[PDB]
Amino acid sequence: MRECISIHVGQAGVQIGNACWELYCLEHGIQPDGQMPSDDSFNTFFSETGAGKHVPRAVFVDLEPTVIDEVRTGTYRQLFHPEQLITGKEDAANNYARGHYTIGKEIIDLVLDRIRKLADQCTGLQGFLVFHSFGGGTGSGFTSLLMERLSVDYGKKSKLEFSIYPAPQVSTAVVEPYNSILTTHTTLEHSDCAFMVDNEAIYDICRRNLDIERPTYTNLNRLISQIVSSITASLRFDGALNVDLTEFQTNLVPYPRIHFPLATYAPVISAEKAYHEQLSVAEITNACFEPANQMVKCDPRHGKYMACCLLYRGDVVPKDVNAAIATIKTKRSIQFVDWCPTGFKVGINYQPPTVVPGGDLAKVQRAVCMLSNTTAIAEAWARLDHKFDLMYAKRAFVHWYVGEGMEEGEFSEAREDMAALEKDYEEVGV
Amino acid sequence: MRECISIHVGQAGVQIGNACWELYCLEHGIQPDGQMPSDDSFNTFFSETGAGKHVPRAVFVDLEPTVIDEVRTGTYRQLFHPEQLITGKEDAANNYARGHYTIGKEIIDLVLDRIRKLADQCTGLQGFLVFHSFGGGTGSGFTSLLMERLSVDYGKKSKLEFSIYPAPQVSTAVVEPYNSILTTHTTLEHSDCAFMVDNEAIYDICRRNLDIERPTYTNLNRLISQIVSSITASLRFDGALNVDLTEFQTNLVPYPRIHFPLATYAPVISAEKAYHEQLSVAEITNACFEPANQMVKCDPRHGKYMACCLLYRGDVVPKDVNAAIATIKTKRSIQFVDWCPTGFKVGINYQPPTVVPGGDLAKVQRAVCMLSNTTAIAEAWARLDHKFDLMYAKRAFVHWYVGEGMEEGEFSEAREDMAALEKDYEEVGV
Amino acid sequence: MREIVHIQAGQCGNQIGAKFWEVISDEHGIDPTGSYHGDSDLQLERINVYYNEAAGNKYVPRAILVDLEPGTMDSVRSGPFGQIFRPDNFVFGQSGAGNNWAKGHYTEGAELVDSVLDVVRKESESCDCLQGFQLTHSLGGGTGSGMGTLLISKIREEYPDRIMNTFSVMPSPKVSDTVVEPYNATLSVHQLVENTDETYSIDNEALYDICFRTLKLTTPTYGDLNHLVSATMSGVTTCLRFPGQLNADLRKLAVNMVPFPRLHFFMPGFAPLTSRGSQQYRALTVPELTQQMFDSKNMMAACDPRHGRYLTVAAIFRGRMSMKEVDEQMLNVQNKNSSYFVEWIPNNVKTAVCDIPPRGLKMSATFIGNSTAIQELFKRISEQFTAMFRRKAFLHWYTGEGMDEMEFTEAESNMNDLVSEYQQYQ
Amino acid sequence: MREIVHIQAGQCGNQIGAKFWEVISDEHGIDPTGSYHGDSDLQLERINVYYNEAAGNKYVPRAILVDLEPGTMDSVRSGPFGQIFRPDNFVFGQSGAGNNWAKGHYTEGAELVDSVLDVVRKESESCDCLQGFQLTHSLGGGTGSGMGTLLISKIREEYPDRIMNTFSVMPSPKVSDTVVEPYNATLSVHQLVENTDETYSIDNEALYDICFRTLKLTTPTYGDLNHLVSATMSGVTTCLRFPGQLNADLRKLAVNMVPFPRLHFFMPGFAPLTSRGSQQYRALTVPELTQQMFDSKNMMAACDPRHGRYLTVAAIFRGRMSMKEVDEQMLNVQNKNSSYFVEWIPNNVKTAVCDIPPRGLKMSATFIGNSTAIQELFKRISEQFTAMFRRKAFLHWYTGEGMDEMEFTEAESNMNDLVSEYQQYQ
Ligand SMILES: CC(=O)O[C@H]1C(=O)[C@@]2(C)[C@H]([C@H](OC(=O)c3ccccc3)[C@]3(O)C[C@H](OC(=O)[C@H](O)[C@@H](NC(=O)c4ccccc4)c4ccccc4)C(C)=C1C3(C)C)[C@]1(OC(C)=O)CO[C@@H]1C[C@@H]2O
Ligand SMILES: CC(=O)O[C@H]1C(=O)[C@@]2(C)[C@H]([C@H](OC(=O)c3ccccc3)[C@]3(O)C[C@H](OC(=O)[C@H](O)[C@@H](NC(=O)c4ccccc4)c4ccccc4)C(C)=C1C3(C)C)[C@]1(OC(C)=O)CO[C@@H]1C[C@@H]2O
Ligand SMILES: Nc1nc2c(ncn2[C@@H]2O[C@H](COP(=O)(O)OP(=O)(O)OP(=O)(O)O)[C@@H](O)[C@H]2O)c(=O)[nH]1
Ligand SMILES: Nc1nc2c(ncn2[C@@H]2O[C@H](COP(=O)(O)OP(=O)(O)OP(=O)(O)O)[C@@H](O)[C@H]2O)c(=O)[nH]1
Ligand SMILES: Nc1nc2c(ncn2[C@@H]2O[C@H](COP(=O)(O)OP(=O)(O)O)[C@@H](O)[C@H]2O)c(=O)[nH]1
Ligand SMILES: Nc1nc2c(ncn2[C@@H]2O[C@H](COP(=O)(O)OP(=O)(O)O)[C@@H](O)[C@H]2O)c(=O)[nH]1
Ligand SMILES: [Mg+2]
Ligand SMILES: [Mg+2]
């Protein structure tokens, strides 16, 4: 009961997955061979076979072999079922249309057959946890092919989606704006709560809080997994105020399309800093309202908040939480909408945050993940549609998308649908 | 494969041949009896029989016995096949018409039968190397009878031709201008690249560079063979830039009739001088653009260059060659045509120049043969047609040519066709 | 799994190719006998990208070797790695190309291409999933320029959706060994602009400038130039042979690199490069790897990128390095040099990062630049062609092979059309 | 192989001939018996040019000996080399020519020529390839002048394409032994100008001038004059008997030497020549060999070449020598003496170079000059003829043999026509 099917797509989604499953195995005490030495706390994330082997409720999908062949060879080769690590032959080439129309069109009915064989083991499936890059060809095009199928096949089930989204300055591709804009139909129509994350924001959090001068991606993926462990903690553990995955959405989402919250986590801190400050509930609650800790490069003070889910975990008590959010309501720099006088959903879970033993991040008695619907996020969209406009005015790479079976008009129809989302997040702030 | 049939005509061609075959035997390590003590490097010039005897791909033709009976008696009597040393009974008397119409008319079908029996042993025949005097009766008249037959019998095959041509002052005959002018149809219509050489120019090169005050012909023929060994070296040996015998012509010849290049070789030097200078690639490259080293008495500065083939051999490296020809392009005294901005074909072969052990010429690590299409050579023609005009205005020896079956009008028709060649080499310089 | 078929044409293409097979055999840990002798499983994991597996665990490279003369086959077969190649994949004539493009395309190689193409089929049918064709040649002379572009045309017609990826050594005015290179090159660029998906434009003048002003080699040979070319050939395929933090297939390069279909002529480069007497004083770190990689001195075509703007650059890094540090430096470069990148593309740099640096390096970068300055290479070739063609000089050698003055006029027309399209975006 | 048939007529022709056979037998190393006794293979390589090979390795000279008296046959047959000749080749009458050209041509030799000509056939049919006829005679007296020119006419009609080459001792005013030499010579020059291909004009006045002012002989005999003639006879055929750097057949001489058909009257010479008391102080080198060879004192006709211009000169050198040095000296001569050569021929000197110098010399040159000054020999003969003929003196001796005054008028007419053709080009 309370199962989640976790679907990891492209290189970004698979490598965040290889950090998520590194965490969940430590947090439930499962060995990297899937065995458990010595309560059903693992049941959300792992199916148990009669040998005493816990097999993860996850699908890994990539259109090329390289990243999943590394999962099939590294320390987790014995964790996963061998046919739910799914590879094609041909890379999607950072082209949405290869992911959606031409290459991913061959693998999709093998992917959905594995998701069906997972869902048929779930006794009370709670939702999908979908992990991807907005800038990738597999990330945008295959996730958008998959979600369209899952939204007719599992129409009632909540689809939570964790997206690495293009930055203000940092970028890895020229066509990252095209793939991201083409994805905006997926998140609007075939998703229920979409967590945008930014590489440049997490790099700055790493520089300021973790004292690490030059991080890899493995440093980011240990922060993106710490957030999903904190979202799902109420599904897995005992708490004072456990939050259901639909209870979460009923407080986060004010209007059907207004489901793009920010997320942040506290305390992100180096183990050397964590001795010299006390890290009380009020300190870590106030840390979530700093621009310095937002994992998208936009300023929350240029918006209004609509709703917050303060998802506390570890040694946290409801007194201290009420006393903390009363100070957040006292501060005039943190502005809410006139129509949400309640503001805060609170969850409080008794399980401390798990340290990954190779990690940059301290042992702490308390953490909070704050997931936060705010008008400010529209600036991250108003950044990227201005990158799209400069290139599409020249038609600057469009022949590679048209050459792989896409209609040219889908670029106009995607920039149009993004302007209607960027309108809605401005329209509710009044 | 890569065979050449070498045809030596009259006294000059046979005696240059007796220096060429002296050289090729040393260079490939073949004894004067045709045996080889201890790679197919010899294959261009020698057929190999099952006894381990290497027999040269050559025909020697003379209308009188004296010079070839000396080849049949000297140290090379055992080298050649006895029926490819071909003699008539009767001298051509320095009369073109005896060579072409009256005496050589009897030997021609025996000469072509030997050339056929050589060509039928060639697996991939590259061309003909034809050696002769322009001033001789056999040299002009028999070569022009032979070439007319070879140009219908072997029409595709390249016919390279090495001509001893009459000098400004030095001469051995009164009728040398008549025989040379009558030959100009042969070189224009039935030849593909014609290397004019001059006895008076090589005598001056011998006086200045070799320190030999009074040379014989054996001193000249060891320089004329050193040039053909350098032309053919890329056919016989490994190199950094090997030049094919048609690759050579595609760079030398800008227009079908414009195939009369100069040639020069460096370092021509005495063994006593060669210790006191270093003879670098740049020194020997610059030596080829001195009027002092041209083997026809004409001044290259009174012309424009069209194309050069710098055929380097021995210890030469492509760096040093590029650095050398950049200085030749820097010098304004060396003038090229406006329509050849590339100027230089380069060949670089790994085999050092072979010293003939009785020779006047030094051991050197490096040589270059520069073969060079230039407008200047038209002065060597404008010298000799002025010698023809003085005699033909009086009809000064014409009764000996008319008496042996020639049409009188062929003298007018040959002086006419020479004026059309001397027009073409002036016409392209603009 | 993403097999490449490699093809070598003429002397230059077989020489940069026969050095390339020594470089990637060192990477994959393959002995000159074809046996594996490497350290690591990662060397073996993608050995199929370039080699067929054979009996006794011998690995045979998927090279086709093409020439119109036997002498370069004889020089390769006898060479440092010559025994590694399949005897059937040496396809050759007897009489050469004469440095004539029309001998390559219409006569001597038109006879031979039926014997080449049916070997390219045996290799491509042995592939599990072919990604593309990797052709090494020169644009001067006749074999690489005229037979290699005949062969590109035949393979393009037969495999229209696979990547056609060519490494193309091409003429320059101050380092030329041949009279008719402007003709041969102009007739060849007319085939590359239509058929290839990528063409990597390489120059002996720029390869000598790296040897003299960076490596400080006193006497650089063609063997030293072939080593600079083959380092970048090994560089661009790295992400389909080794694991990485950002993987980029040759197609993931093309989609990012080629804004408009015909603008696919790239200027490659490599880092680190040092003299052997100064490797002791450098720090190999990504900022220093970057400052060399974007230096006008480091790039392997004579076009100074300060005479144009980049459309796209791709920096394919190799080694253990930070993604923040790589993303920082590729930002700092195009903001501090913003006058040298086109402002209608909002990020001009693609990045890729492989976990496995070249044997004996801690880090490497292979650079690919698409720049409007590449017009200066096609402009100078066209200006040399024009002087020879305005007086029909040397054209009996081409028209004697059945070619027309109309084909020369149409090739130089298409050359100026390619120049005009790069100049348009400058 | 290029056989010569040699013919001797009258006392002078048999005396210069019988000395010539002693000279060429010394060269070819043949004993007075007819047996070979020489040093060298080169002596035996071309023995066929002048001899028939016969049983016991005896070599019989291809000479026909003709006279109208027995007494010169008796003097030759008994002489130093007399036993070498074939007994059948001595063809002779009994009653002499009386110093009468008409006895030679119409009576005494007209009887005998049927017995001569049928021996010239046996020798010419025994040849492998005949190149020509080499006839020795005198133009004074009756046998050589009148029978020898009858025989030239008969051999010319029978062998029209072979070289007819004559050595012709001929009259002069200050050294004459006979009253009617002007008549005999004028009747004989009329046959030489039409029939011969070359005629070498020799004079006893010039042969005595060489003996007195060069050789410093106190009492020169006809045996000493015959030795000077026969050195130049051996000289001009050298290149068909021995190897050389430049070979010249008698036909290769004629084609270069004879500009207009009838201008074939040559003035021979020889070098070195010294007194036996001064050979110790000379250097024989080519420049000194040249400065003597072109000296007006060295030539064997009384005509000073400073009274005309050369049409052609041929210098047939023998010995080991430089071609630069020979070509230098034959240039320097005709540029420093340019007023003595015709300026409508741009090079007046033919050269030839044999590798084998005469026995006991290190070098030799035989000189042949075709000069407009030869008119002075035909002019003086015609001026002597004219004085005798204007009064019909001695003509009953010729008209008694059936001759006409019309034949005298026609001969002196043709003499002045030959003089006028040499004077025309002066
Ligand atoms: C101790 C040390 O640092 O040694 C270096 C070295 O001194 C330098 C100078 C090397 C050296 O490079 C050269 O000598 C060279 C000469 C002419 C042209 C090109 C290179 C080196 O030979 C080259 C060699 O590189 C390799 O071995 C790579 O794996 C390379 N493959 C080959 O060079 C190779 C050679 C022979 C046979 C097979 C392969 C490679 C490059 C790209 C992609 C894959 C592989 C290296 C690191 C070094 C030495 C040995 C001195 C350099 O080359 C590379 C590619 O790193 C030249 O500048 C760099 C910087 C290095 O510091
Ligand atoms: C030591 C030395 O130098 O002896 C010479 C000599 O002293 C000189 C004076 C010789 C001598 O000549 C005479 O005495 C002579 C007398 C009258 C007429 C002509 C010659 C010599 O007898 C002549 C003789 O020549 C030959 O033997 C040639 O081969 C010659 N044949 C004959 O003379 C001969 C004599 C007898 C029987 C057979 C042949 C020859 C010439 C041309 C072509 C072929 C062969 C030579 C060199 C010399 C002596 C011996 C002193 C000279 O003759 C020649 C042709 O070289 C006369 O001036 C030259 C210069 C020589 O120096
Ligand atoms: N944090 C993090 N970001 C990543 C990681 N891998 C990739 N990214 C980001 O993903 C974006 C590019 O997406 P790709 O990695 O090319 O996505 P993909 O689905 O594999 O794309 P295709 O190769 O075309 O199929 C860039 O903006 C990267 O910064 C990772 O492991 N962690
Ligand atoms: N370098 C050189 N030049 C030579 C040689 N032999 C002859 N010559 C030149 O050849 C030219 C004359 O040509 P001939 O030797 O008479 O040619 P040929 O073909 O034998 O003439 P014929 O006897 O008429 O058949 C002259 O200008 C000579 O200088 C030789 O061995 N070497
Ligand atoms: N880098 C490199 N360049 C070469 C090599 N050999 C020749 N070249 C140069 O590039 C050009 C190549 O032409 P080539 O390959 O010889 O013509 P082809 O054989 O007819 O195709 C030559 O003119 C040389 O300047 C080599 O080994 N390496
Ligand atoms: N050189 C030379 N001249 C001779 C000889 N005998 C005679 N002469 C001269 O030349 C002339 C030749 O005439 P000759 O031969 O006697 O007349 P033929 O016998 O009737 O032909 C004579 O008058 C002599 O002056 C000789 O042995 N040698
Ligand atoms: Mg991907
Ligand atoms: Mg000859």
Short mmCIF file of C-alpha atoms in Angstrom, two decimals, chain A residues 160-162 193-197 224 226-232 243 245 248 251-253 260-265 288-289 294 305-312 343-345 368-374:
data_model
loop_
_atom_site.label_atom_id
_atom_site.label_comp_id
_atom_site.label_asym_id
_atom_site.label_seq_id
_atom_site.Cartn_x
_atom_site.Cartn_y
_atom_site.Cartn_z
CA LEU A 160 4.70 14.48 -9.66
CA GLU A 161 7.53 15.64 -11.89
CA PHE A 162 11.13 16.70 -11.06
CA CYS A 193 2.77 19.04 -9.59
CA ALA A 194 5.97 20.04 -11.42
CA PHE A 195 9.15 20.82 -9.42
CA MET A 196 11.47 22.97 -11.55
CA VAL A 197 15.14 22.90 -10.41
CA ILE A 224 17.61 16.83 -5.53
CA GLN A 226 17.14 14.91 -0.38
CA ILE A 227 14.03 16.91 -1.52
CA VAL A 228 12.15 13.81 -2.83
CA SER A 229 13.05 11.84 0.30
CA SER A 230 11.49 14.81 2.18
CA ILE A 231 8.34 14.90 -0.08
CA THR A 232 7.85 11.12 0.29
CA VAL A 243 1.03 14.67 4.74
CA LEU A 245 0.60 12.96 -1.62
CA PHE A 248 0.11 17.94 -0.39
CA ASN A 251 -2.72 22.77 -0.22
CA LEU A 252 -0.07 23.54 -2.89
CA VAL A 253 -2.29 23.99 -5.99
CA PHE A 260 4.71 24.84 -10.61
CA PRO A 261 6.02 25.36 -7.03
CA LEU A 262 9.56 26.26 -6.08
CA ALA A 263 11.38 23.96 -3.69
CA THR A 264 14.16 24.57 -1.16
CA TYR A 265 15.73 22.54 1.67
CA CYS A 288 13.75 28.76 3.37
CA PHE A 289 12.65 32.40 2.71
CA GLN A 294 15.93 28.89 -3.81
CA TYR A 305 3.48 33.56 -2.27
CA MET A 306 0.22 31.62 -2.74
CA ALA A 307 0.81 28.55 -0.53
CA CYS A 308 3.77 26.90 1.28
CA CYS A 309 4.23 23.28 2.39
CA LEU A 310 6.81 23.32 5.21
CA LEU A 311 7.65 19.56 5.31
CA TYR A 312 9.67 19.24 8.54
CA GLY A 343 -0.71 30.49 3.77
CA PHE A 344 1.03 27.45 5.31
CA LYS A 345 0.46 23.73 5.10
CA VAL A 368 12.70 21.09 6.38
CA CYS A 369 11.83 20.85 2.73
CA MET A 370 9.76 23.90 1.80
CA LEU A 371 7.73 23.45 -1.38
CA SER A 372 6.25 26.79 -2.36
CA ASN A 373 3.77 28.09 -4.94
CA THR A 374 4.76 31.72 -5.76
#
